[PDB]
Symmetry: D2
Subunit: 277 residues, 4 copies
């Protein structure tokens, strides 16, 4: 039994309210299941994908701000933004546990309705792959229906990635970074650089001296590990919902998702492990 | 690098698209922060609550189908929907971990833009409270500025709660349940009932005979516990973000949320703990 | 400011206490770090493995009891026990986030104290692997140093796995299970395809079998998730170095990730 | 040198002795849950002492890294309530009786941490008179500054207007909320760019406190579903007494300050 407290605002007709702020007429009218007749499991499928897109939208928002901080040598602010980015990635990774309550026989009841639609065609996800530095320009042909989107990806292809922004940062602080990281063709995905090995060994072996750099390396390594966790959980959900069936978007499915899982964002950070003392 | 596989569809201009299926133009233009100049932390804020509203939207949809299964005595199917249900609640509780990177000085550059806006005004939240049985008609009067959703809250206010559908299910199976659960003024929140004590002791003490009922008992305790934890984590974030300031919605804040934490949805379930044996 | 209630027992001078009951003296004296001087990270290292061994111990206990309920056609009870088993795998998966605060320059301070010791020689771990059906008789050799434990492991190798007991349950219920030495891995069987297809295609008749099939998919998935977090933790801390146990490291762990406990469960998704 | 030998797994894995006759299936969950928790509480103490030693030395980045691991331990501790909640009250009733008066209220390590964090209650030492040398370990943590008091000493070296009280004093008393720290915390939260170090430390302690309150709450919610409103084996009222610890605050001034910032 809880009594309405005095002082709670109740005439709200000419004022800003929660659904108005949050644009919830528009937000909560965006779920349009297409099964005929309605499948109970369709609503889950939509919500799960939409909550992920909202988190990915926020993750983009925070990564951009982390890059701006790095550029300005604002390390504590960068790392704070990065901690929120890791929490976002963690929420993403945690929501697979809802979709694990979707069995393949439930799925076959509406998989049909989706046609060729696939997360492979997520503009926001591809933006983030590109921003972390996994720059594949084949992936621009996917967005040929969409000139504005393909054009916002081109801007990210054309700019240094998160990692390349860290290398530039390191350069400004007298670490032995090649001049090529100051200007080069950024559309070309970072190639593993053996000469960065002694740089990262020197960081991790004077953590007293290179406390900021060592902090940032461990952040980046956290970011990558969490994104790979996201990919693995997605891929395990695939295995349990469609098995080894080809995807809606035309790919081989599990084997195609496995090829991303093999790839590495920040290669010299992990390579340094065989030699660090 | 990963090479684009040969069989990928790239020409989708006349077919159902991911973005059109998920109505992404619409969804990702619902974020309209009001700070001037722009505040970095406002988008976290809107997105935290928006993803919560989407989860709460999925939660009312599973809750409903759980009731329909209860009504039809479809118990395995009911428990399967409650398991999805508890996972939604479990994400809703886990996302608190993101907002806990919002400090009070951050929050202070935009809390003003909100005016009176408060999750206290969340229609879906209240729809679920009322559905789990916390039916307070004083809540209808906070929605008078919106007759349509006021009307939706009355439809649920007037139907049996989830708990009350459970008691009805027990009734159909020969358990010793009072006749009022058959027909009563469903708009009065359930009062704790001492006659249900021997019912639940019987279930918990003979789990081989009453396994279905027993497993559903534990589902509802799970559901209540997960919702308490959402409440508690929301309250703990209130304390770290605004301390003991009054809420934007007019309440005294933490103290006001503390009184909801004190409430219990399924009281005879927890009360039985005091007297239960020994499984036979 | 919290006052002690009158009523609270404060003279335990001769009674059963928390610590006497839990044997906390013997649990809490079991952390024996070898660094000279002490390395602050060694304690993490030790406790992380030990909580995990305690959880592996609880999982072996729960899984045997799921098998017993299964032998007995006690399906609700079997799933209740698979529910706790899942939660125990879930703690095992979660605690990886602590050891992920260990950096490689930290670890190089005491890695060498450890000699050849490795979770590869975790007896409880391997007990679980054999239980879930990943039986490799070559594993017995690594415990020849410990014949009580070696022989106990051999007893699990020669009994039906959790998966084999499910299939045998299905047989007692009129499922077209083949009439067909448990120490060999279970070879995948395309004649089980239609058995699984029938289960998933009429959930209202085979709701019990359907539930359990889904409980085993969950367990396998949670287990793979464990292997993956351990493996990603391996890449962050030793990269591609050879393991202390003498293996290739991440490579040898990847070969385990590619393995499947319940092949025909996953296989049936292509035809359902 | 083996895994099993390195980790003392013979004494570790024979420390589980259920007392129920005939043995109860659920007794092993029960034992393991409290034992894993104890091993985590042992790590948590090992880390927070280290973090105090870093603060004493003005080593902020090292202190923050150990507080990062410490939150992760608190996190496993809170998460594990999910296994224990598969135990139903009728299952518990099968072995509750073997337990006598034993209670987590007698956890030495829990109490060590309560006292480090600075909820010092000298009343507690009595519970432990049966173990006189563990009672004296406790008294050593009652006599030293808390983690919070060491933070306030840190601020004082660095030019914050911290009272003279906190330079030395009778640490055996719970810290008593102090209004004069308010302008202190306001300066810090209002000039993050100046006091980024202090600001981030302030936010870490708020994270430790919240997570510890979350452990308390999930423990309390478990006690409800398992024994409900019954008295505890240790002799308290049970839920009501635990609810009294939940209303306690470790670091009042950090939460008090939300009232006036910005
Ligand atoms: C159980 C439901 C799901 C199944 C069966 C599934 C399956 C697949 C398959 C087979 C692919 C490869 C592309 C293709 O051929 O379609 C794919 C890619 C993808 N999915 Fe899903 N997926 C599911 C849910 C989701 C959800 C909820 C999200 C969140 C938005 C998501 C995001 C992605 C993304 C971003 C890719 C591109 C991955 C890459 O390019 O490496 N998927 N998925
Ligand atoms: C950090 C941000 C938040 C703060 C400071 C906060 C604070 C408050 C306060 C002070 C109240 C009491 C009503 C009033 O006077 O305003 C309230 C209620 C509520 N908030 Fe929040 N809230 C926050 C975030 C959220 C979010 C993200 C959600 C998303 C679900 C949410 C959902 C609710 C709900 C449903 C209530 C009503 C609870 C009840 O009636 O028992 N809040 N909150
Ligand atoms: C920094 C921590 C760790 C590293 C660098 C590590 C490394 C390794 C490596 C390299 C192997 C392969 C065999 C070898 O050559 O030694 C292995 C196997 C193993 N580790 Fe770890 N491990 C770590 C922590 C842990 C923890 C905390 C546990 C918990 C028990 C664990 C359990 C295992 C198990 C069970 C195996 C064998 C798995 C199989 O045979 O497929 N490890 N580990
Ligand atoms: C079914 C499980 C449990 C029940 C029914 C339970 C019940 C209680 C009760 C009633 C109390 C208050 C004192 C008393 O009368 O004994 C208590 C205290 C305590 N329990 Fe538990 N408990 C449970 C599990 C656990 C576990 C797994 C731990 C892990 C270490 C734990 C740690 C504690 C601690 C540290 C206290 C004292 C807290 C304080 O002084 O504020 N408990 N428990
Ligand atoms: N990277 C982990 C642990 C950590 C905290 N501070 C650090 C400083 C340096 C290296 C690692 C850390 C985290 O950010 O939570
Ligand atoms: N690509 C997925 C389909 C999918 C999963 N989630 C989605 C969300 C929207 C559109 C399609 C999807 C499959 O092969 O089945
Ligand atoms: N309620 C817990 C444990 C459980 C599983 N099956 C049960 C059957 C009856 C009672 C409890 C249970 C869960 O669903 O995880
Ligand atoms: N009640 C909150 C305001 C709030 C929190 N989250 C929200 C989401 C949307 C609108 C308003 C809010 C406060 O008192 O500060
Ligand atoms: N496998 C999931 C979802 C589930 C619940 N009950 C089921 C019955 C049948 C199939 C799947 C389920 C779980 O155990 O929570
Ligand atoms: N095998 C690990 C060492 C290891 C990790 N956890 C352990 C626990 C106990 C003994 C050894 C270990 C390595 O290659 O470095
Ligand atoms: N307290 C959170 C958020 C955070 C990270 N860095 C910070 C610096 C200042 C204040 C808060 C933070 C954490 O430790 O991750
Ligand atoms: N205090 C508990 C008993 C208890 C719970 N967990 C424990 C672990 C060890 C010893 C006793 C306990 C009760 O009232 O039932």
């Amino acid at each position: 039994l809880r009594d309405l407290e005095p002082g709670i605002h109740t005439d709200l007709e000419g004022r800003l309210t929660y659904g108005g702020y949050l644009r919830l007429d528009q937000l909560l009218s965006a779920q349009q299941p297409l099964s005929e007749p309605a499948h109970h499991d369709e609503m889950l499928f939509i919500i799960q994908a939409q909550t992920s897109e909202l988190w990915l939208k926020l993750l983009a928002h925070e990564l951009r701000a982390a890059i701006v901080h790095l550029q300005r040598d604002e390390v504590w602010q960068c790392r704070k933004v990065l901690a929120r980015s890791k929490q976002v990635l963690r929420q993403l990774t945690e929501q697979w546990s809802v979709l694990e309550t979707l069995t393949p026989s439930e799925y076959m009841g509406f998989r049909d309705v989706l046609g060729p639609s696939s997360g492979f065609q997520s503009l926001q996800y591809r933006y983030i792959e590109f921003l972390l530095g996994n720059k594949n320009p084949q992936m621009l042909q996917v967005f040929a229906y969409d000139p504005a989107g393909q054009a916002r990806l081109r801007e990210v292809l054309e700019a240094p990635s998160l990692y390349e922004e860290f290398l530039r940062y390191l350069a400004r602080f007298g670490h032995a970074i090649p001049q090529q990281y100051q200007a080069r063709d950024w559309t070309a995905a970072h190639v593993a650089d053996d000469t960065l090995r002694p740089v990262f060994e020197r960081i991790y072996e004077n953590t007293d001296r290179y406390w900021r750099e060592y902090s940032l390396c461990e952040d980046l390594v956290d970011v990558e590990t969490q994104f790979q966790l996201w990919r693995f959980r997605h891929m395990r959900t695939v295995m349990r919902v469609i098995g080894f069936k080809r995807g809606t978007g035309g790919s081989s499915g599990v084997g195609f998702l496995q090829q991303a899982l093999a790839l590495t964002f920040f290669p010299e950070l992990f390579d340094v492990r065989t030699s660090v003392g």
